[PDB]
Amino acid sequence: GVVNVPSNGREKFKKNWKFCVGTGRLGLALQKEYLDHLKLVQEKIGFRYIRGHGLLSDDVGIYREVEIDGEMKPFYNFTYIDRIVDSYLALNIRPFIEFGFMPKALASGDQTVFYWKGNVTPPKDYNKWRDLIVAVVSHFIERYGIEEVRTWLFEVWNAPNLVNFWKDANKQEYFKLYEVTARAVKSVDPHLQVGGPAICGGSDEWITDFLHFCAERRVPVDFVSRHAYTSKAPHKKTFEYYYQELEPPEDMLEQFKTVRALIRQSPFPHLPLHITEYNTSYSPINPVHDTALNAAYIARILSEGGDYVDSFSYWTFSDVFEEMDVPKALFHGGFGLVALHSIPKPTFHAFTFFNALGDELLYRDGEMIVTRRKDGSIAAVLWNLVMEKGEGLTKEVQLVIPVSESAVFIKRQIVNEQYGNAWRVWKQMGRPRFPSRQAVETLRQVAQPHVMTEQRRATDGVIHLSIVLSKNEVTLIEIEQVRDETSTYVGLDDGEITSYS
Amino acid sequence: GVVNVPSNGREKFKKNWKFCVGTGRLGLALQKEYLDHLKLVQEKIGFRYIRGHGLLSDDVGIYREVEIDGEMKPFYNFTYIDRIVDSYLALNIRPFIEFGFMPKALASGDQTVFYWKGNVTPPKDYNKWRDLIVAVVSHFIERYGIEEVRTWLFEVWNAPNLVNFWKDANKQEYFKLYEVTARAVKSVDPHLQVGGPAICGGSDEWITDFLHFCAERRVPVDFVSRHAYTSKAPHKKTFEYYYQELEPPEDMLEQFKTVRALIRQSPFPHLPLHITEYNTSYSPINPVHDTALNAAYIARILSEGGDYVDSFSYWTFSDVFEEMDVPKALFHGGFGLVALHSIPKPTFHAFTFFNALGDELLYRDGEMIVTRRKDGSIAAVLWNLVMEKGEGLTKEVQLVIPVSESAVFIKRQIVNEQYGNAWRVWKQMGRPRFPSRQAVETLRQVAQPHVMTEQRRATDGVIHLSIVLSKNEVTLIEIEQVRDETSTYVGLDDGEITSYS
Amino acid sequence: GVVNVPSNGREKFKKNWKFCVGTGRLGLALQKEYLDHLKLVQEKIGFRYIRGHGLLSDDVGIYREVEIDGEMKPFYNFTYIDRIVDSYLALNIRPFIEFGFMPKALASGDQTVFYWKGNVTPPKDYNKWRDLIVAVVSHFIERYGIEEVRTWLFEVWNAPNLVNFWKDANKQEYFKLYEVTARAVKSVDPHLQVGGPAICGGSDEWITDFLHFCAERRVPVDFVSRHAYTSKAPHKKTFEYYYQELEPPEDMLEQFKTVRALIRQSPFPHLPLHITEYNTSYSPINPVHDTALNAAYIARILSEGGDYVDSFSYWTFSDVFEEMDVPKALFHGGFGLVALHSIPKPTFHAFTFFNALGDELLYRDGEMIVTRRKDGSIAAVLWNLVMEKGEGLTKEVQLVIPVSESAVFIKRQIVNEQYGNAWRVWKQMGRPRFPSRQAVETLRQVAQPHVMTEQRRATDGVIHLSIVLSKNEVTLIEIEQVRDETSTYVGLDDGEITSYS
Amino acid sequence: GVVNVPSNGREKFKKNWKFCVGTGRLGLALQKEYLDHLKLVQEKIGFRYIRGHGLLSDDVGIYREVEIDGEMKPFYNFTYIDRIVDSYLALNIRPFIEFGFMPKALASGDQTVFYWKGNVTPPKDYNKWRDLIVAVVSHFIERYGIEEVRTWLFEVWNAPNLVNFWKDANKQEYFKLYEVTARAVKSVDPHLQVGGPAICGGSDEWITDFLHFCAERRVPVDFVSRHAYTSKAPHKKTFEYYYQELEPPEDMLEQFKTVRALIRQSPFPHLPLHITEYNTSYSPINPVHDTALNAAYIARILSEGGDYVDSFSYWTFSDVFEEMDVPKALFHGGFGLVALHSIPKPTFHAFTFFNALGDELLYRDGEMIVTRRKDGSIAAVLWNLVMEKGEGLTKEVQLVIPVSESAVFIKRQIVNEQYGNAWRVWKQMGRPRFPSRQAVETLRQVAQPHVMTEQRRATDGVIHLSIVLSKNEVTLIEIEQVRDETSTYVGLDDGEITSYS
Numbered sequence A, B, C, D: 001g002v003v004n005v006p007s008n009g010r011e012k013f014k015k016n017w018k019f020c021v022g023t024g025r026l027g028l029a030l031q032k033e034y035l036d037h038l039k040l041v042q043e044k045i046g047f048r049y050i051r052g053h054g055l056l057s058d059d060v061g062i063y064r065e066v067e068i069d070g071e072m073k074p075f076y077n078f079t080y081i082d083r084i085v086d087s088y089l090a091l092n093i094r095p096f097i098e099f100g101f102m103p104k105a106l107a108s109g110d111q112t113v114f115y116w117k118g119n120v121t122p123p124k125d126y127n128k129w130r131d132l133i134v135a136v137v138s139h140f141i142e143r144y145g146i147e148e149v150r151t152w153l154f155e156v157w158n159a160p161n162l163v164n165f166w167k168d169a170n171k172q173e174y175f176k177l178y179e180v181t182a183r184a185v186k187s188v189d190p191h192l193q194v195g196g197p198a199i200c201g202g203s204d205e206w207i208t209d210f211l212h213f214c215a216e217r218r219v220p221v222d223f224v225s226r227h228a229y230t231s232k233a234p235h236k237k238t239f240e241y242y243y244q245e246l247e248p249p250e251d252m253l254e255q256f257k258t259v260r261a262l263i264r265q266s267p268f269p270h271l272p273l274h275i276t277e278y279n280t281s282y283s284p285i286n287p288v289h290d291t292a293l294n295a296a297y298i299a300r301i302l303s304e305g306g307d308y309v310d311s312f313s314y315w316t317f318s319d320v321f322e323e324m325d326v327p328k329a330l331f332h333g334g335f336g337l338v339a340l341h342s343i344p345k346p347t348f349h350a351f352t353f354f355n356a357l358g359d360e361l362l363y364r365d366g367e368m369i370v371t372r373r374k375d376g377s378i379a380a381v382l383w384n385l386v387m388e389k390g391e392g393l394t395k396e397v398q399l400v401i402p403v404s405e406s407a408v409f410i411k412r413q414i415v416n417e418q419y420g421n422a423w424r425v426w427k428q429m430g431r432p433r434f435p436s437r438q439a440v441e442t443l444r445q446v447a448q449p450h451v452m453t454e455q456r457r458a459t460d461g462v463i464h465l466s467i468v469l470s471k472n473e474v475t476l477i478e479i480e481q482v483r484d485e486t487s488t489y490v491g492l493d494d495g496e497i498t499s500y501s
């Protein structure tokens, strides 16, 4: 493919793609492994927010009753989220808070979800729930101050359209929960941004009904949130895996555009859309998350998602996760960008590569994005998504690039099936479920992207880049001006080194 | 050619090769860059000793006078060595102390050497020198304890046979020095291992005459020390470089062997030989040091060195160095295993690869060493030294390794003219003298060994490795037993992941 | 009163006191907070062993089924203990392993203990319990090597004599469990030191019977294990506290003495006694743990416990704990030496003070220990336990100490009701449950022990220390030799500095 | 003396006091010790700028020549200052650059200053000098960007009115150097802030003459810079100390006010004034620097200096220094707020305590500053300077603060002759010149300010605080509102803890 890149760009590539990221339940943020991962993530990708479950679930331990006199009185315990939210700010990432699930002692019923058993029943008392919300949100304000907390976003629950996350998928009782929550939030401070309905795909009439509910009853909404996944249901389970086929990335972008339109035609036309969960597969034990295909796939979404949505949050930044029990093996199919022992998966590198793009959009299509940075250098992320089985499937992309700076340093980073892929190498080691330190160390060496560099002189003010992508490669290409200093090394002559010319 | 690696080995590959390592002057150990460098070097190569000049030179500031009442009296400032040596022991490296150069205020003349102007004249008074030595040795014992200082070694002066390092290259006067120093040391504790004559090559009758001076006069010697290089004197200079031709590595090994023999024919037939400086070139501004050639070259030394010499200390661990002024550019020909910004140079990777070898020497010729680890894995370092100008020059090596382990994990790391070579990429950047942090980080990325993994079945309890070395490649190959766990993943099927088979 | 310290000591004060230390369950070692706390504890007190609950309980996640080829087969997930033990060894602590509690899937009934719901029923199948032990112990050996694991200890279950921890406190069923476990361990390696009965107090015929059981059936036992507390059952509960009266520490030492005597009467008279949990109170929400009284109390135990027992393991090193839910406030009555946010509690400082003592036991009574270090210096720890309510209550102590020195530097460190006491200060702050970072730093500053130094000249080779201990003071006194260097500062006169004399 | 602190104050206490700080020559910035110190300084006191010598002196290595052909051509080496200025920015501190001294290779003459021998002669060629500056400033802008460099300040030379620092203290020649420098700076970018004359006191007609010179010859000046000290010429020397009397703190403030007047009376009446060096003693071996008096003395300067000068830069932040050779002992009278081994001296605490103050000035006089912070809390630094010899000499300050809050947590911090004073304890240890690590740790533990806390109820809507300062005591007091949480601890009763009430 021959893509002629212009010197100038009308558009700006926005940073929506790294606005927010996902995470396993907040209680897992107490784990050193977790925070190692979060550190890595925030050093290499700069997420602004993080979005998880469990804030009000009982391992974090906020909501209790507590026998005083002979009445059960509510007790709010911030010991853990203080630590959690602190560890977050310390890593320059803010909570996209998600109020859920139901504390056990506030639950109206038994139903739970996940291995860690988040209670998914409504509050036995909405006054108690509201007071939870007021307490938490007020607690946050005390700890972090109002100006900090105002930058946070507060989602109400999670996937209420699903029977697993909300008793009977009750639209009406969710809307009651939304309204008590949204009102509770604004009552603490009116700038605080509360939103919903946190629905998973398959039920976008919920967004419309949610926005009709909010307009009709004058319920505050500051954003719509929605999840996006492209995996069909499991066509094969093992004791530790769900294998699922996938719709192409276009399916996710159409999901985004569709929900943007629902918002345009609603009484709240100006509302931000945050996709608070996205990946390929929605199961934390689907091995696709460990693969290069995941990288290549998710790159398209990084490219284009931001046209439709104010943010879209990769579920998750890390394999530290337990919705489906403790990981049974190093590469076990989890959502994480980072695997246990801080081994980036290929998808991590995809974010790393997008994080090198500039603001100025020179060219974008369905398999690349090409940007100018403020120093005049170019940054391109290209990907070769291939959802079909088979080998080779190399795609050459020819890039013609405007460069006035007579010489250029090109640095290219590739992750694919061979490179930046610890999953492949893990396989070769015997798929050790519980690898030794040495094996982890090799895995990490191997998980680094392949780097290639060159100096190229630009003939006619043009650089012609032949970029050969292999199956499911995501690659970062940067073209820097070379300010050559060779001429200051007077007499320099590598021909005077043994073996060199 | 075809190498049939025996299943078993009588001989043990010893750790002589990393007993000790070279350093820029001890004063420079105060530099944060220096410690960063030592720390990397101690994490990836665990050297036991570090040997450098400048212990008694005036930047470290031990020796002074000091008009106290009405008298110029000696003052021993240990502020800097306490901190230097402390920093050494904190990194699990002990000093191979070298008593030099002449404190300015103890100097008998003004001849200095180097940019930092180490004085190279005999002491104006040997009684004061003696006391310096007693004071230093004593102070060390007081700070670190007698048990610890006894593990240290003590060389006396540096290169006294060279006019640059010692006034008139006075053999007789350097023997006076050695005697005063050796006795000084021993008078403090008889078990302190003192030695000399730390000579450079070209005048090895100094070993003979030194050890007869020691026999005649019964001067304690506990080892012989000697430098060893293979570079002729510079035949080109720039304002910045020396370019030297190198003798091949056999010349260094014949140097080792011939000195060993000279010691065996001496009155002290059994003394240890510590080669206290070695590289290819002896100039810290010979770009050869930053190349792959350097690594391939030194790899043979690591392999055989221990045959003839109890230790051999690579000059140096780091480009933190000043003999020829402050590095005028990132890669500037410095002795260092590690370049500024902690960019491993190819020779670094050589040591690191030797660090992965086992005790059991299975096979060794002049281009490889093969070893069994105590868990039964093989570790083999192969190098392809090519001193002749020109491209290509690839060696095909065929390694036939035994192991009744069925399945095998091979990890291969290569560093050559393309991989693990930040010098070649520095040049592509336009030889930035003073690189941006971004350039540095690229350089670091690129300085990493290229890793290649595979799983192979064994046929007939044998692995057959067809190994292709590029020019001046050093490569580590490890063959580990795969204890394969895949069978525990019942239902595991990569064929159920999108794109995978 | 008056105490004349012998210049020489017959006996050695041993390190039994810091052989082992308690931890809240192993699952919590995943917390970054837990490890912060351990690093701290390992730098200031060097514990060799760490004994905790929950190795096999389900948060750590080892034991699962796992439906494979039509059966429920065991699935040993090592993800979490690998990470846990790793981190233990990285901080130079080994597991005093305690095989408990029942994995939910291995359990025969529903009885749990604690908020974390450790199952306390017999295995539904003792063969599978055997295979669990074999799996875990084997796994450890496969990861750490046999020479490492052989240094560990293995306690079977916890407090089988209590109904809360073991169905019916069934003695015969516990012996069955112990036999199965002890043989399973030994079946893996005969060096693996296994032991019980891990009983709480009140019921020491369990030792007698347990050992009778083992003699009769030739069941391997390598040590006896026992808990030791001195608190009566809670007389007052709030929703967050258990308040308890305490027996004096002689009571604990009598427990030690008495259980050792039951071992000498038994068929295994020479068996090690490891007291694997002691504290004052056995409630993790008794505020007593946070006080200076706890420190002063336990210092007597540190002083004398080793006379009777091979180890005694302070429950716990850290307030990272959850047996009674998540800490409801910074100081919440947790067992920890270390409070959250790495705030040392008074008791932490007691260990620290014992960590400064020498081998040579010069003098000891029930309020002090005095030791000679090998450099010749004295180290004394003194405590003024005062269990009575009220203020004042200051012990005077006249130490008369031989010193072979003449000029002496004394460093006293004190923690008591004023200093080294973040609890008192936390109360002044308004008892914030969830203190801000600022408050926490203040608490940490204030948690440090008060230091008083002084130079004293000996008279007639003796130092006469008049020491006043406030109520529940634990104080460390070190008397070190001064090698005065002031004479070398010729002309030094502080009287030539503004204001100084 | 009683002070009725008003609730609100019209004026702001400015942060001029910590705008900038002094340092040893930039070359020492390369030392690990130095950066430990800077780290600490920047974690506890937040300095915006750092100002020292040697930028162009040859240890930093920027100016060389460099025989190319037969010509000596200038060569600029940025290897060191890149690493220095990076290390600066990483620690959030910016260079208050100072162009000096003369590179040997550029020097017109042989006169040097200091042990390290900065050349203090005019350049041999002013074009060469100019080119140096352009080179240096262009480099900065290249590496860090114009926006960043525009925030830096550029002083020309140091103390040109002193014969030691400038050949013949030649005024007219300094103005030539100034003009050439300032013109060189402004030619690179006009917004770069260039300034001088960097004079030491006792010669202020130079500021007048300088500003007339610049006014008349239209030479750019953006700031006046000046040094301020109060020590008289030494009255005793030892081989290692200068001992000096000190004019009182008013003398310095009057120096500040006098120079502000000369500036107002000048052709540039609104120029900022930066005191680029102040301490009490101008010698780096005056033990007053090490003392508590230093602290209490510098406290009035921090309180008030800002009225008269835009900045005032305490020479120096650390003892890493060599103007008078390597430190001969731990506390050796160096300028540093931080002693070697990162042990803060009392003075460091004064900056720390001042760094606790709010912006809103409630009350100030010559012994205290009392401020309100944005959360309504009070912060006051009180000082009791006593320049006379003698014991005791305390000082009661009675602050009467309005608070209608019911209750108050008070946190006080004291460094005086007893507390926060490691010099005092170092003396008790026998003035170890080169202390053991154990000794250093005691020293550090002792270098911490004494902390006293209490809770105080309000009476009459007011708090009456009696603050006893002892000799040369600086003390920080913070009064915060207590939000008492005790009522939530329902049933709490410390009375139910052994020994407590």
Ligand SMILES: O=[N+]([O-])c1ccc([N+](=O)[O-])c(O[C@@H]2OC[C@@H](O)[C@H](O)[C@H]2O)c1
Binding pocket: B053, B158, B159, B162, B164, B199, B200, B201, B227, B228, B229, B277, B282, B283, B284, B323
């Ligand atoms: O160019 N020199 O000053 C020089 C020439 C030859 C030798 N040599 O034959 O050993 C030499 O000596 C040492 O090696 C290089 C230098 O960096 C070391 O400090 C010297 O000991 C130097």
Ligand SMILES: O=[N+]([O-])c1ccc([N+](=O)[O-])c(O[C@@H]2OC[C@@H](O)[C@H](O)[C@H]2O)c1
Binding pocket: D053, D158, D159, D162, D164, D200, D201, D227, D229, D277, D282, D283, D284, D323
């Ligand atoms: O210690 N000296 O050689 C010296 C004496 C007098 C002054 N002075 O009058 O200002 C002085 O100069 C400056 O201040 C102290 C020094 O450390 C700085 O480098 C100079 O700027 C030094």
